[PDB]
Amino acid sequence: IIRGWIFGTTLDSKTQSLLIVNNATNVVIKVCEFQFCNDPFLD
Amino acid sequence: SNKLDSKVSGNYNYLYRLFRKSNLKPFERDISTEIYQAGNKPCNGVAG
């Protein structure tokens, strides 16, 4: 069910928050300020 | 660096701060640019 974890001090793009998403063949890790809403993506 | 940035009446893009609410933890990003309230008065804009 769980396919990643996103950490950071702010949900907006104000600071470089950390992003780890899990996939079927690899793990992409980038700490580079994505925008985040109140609702996470549910795939 | 006296040969590049030294210019009278200009280059006001580098901005330093001195006081905020709490002592923030080391190696933390500085983003917020809201004003500190004086505590005794409800500071909202230009205050005393």
Place this chain on the structure above:
Amino acid sequence: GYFKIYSKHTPIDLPQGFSALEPLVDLPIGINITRFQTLLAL
């Protein structure tokens, strides 16, 4: 200033026993973290 991630896979409330979490990756960034989130799928 170092992001340490320890993980351990065990085939199975938390179940009883003991399993030492082995370090998986060590990411060398020193980014500041104050809160943290979790994500699910449907």
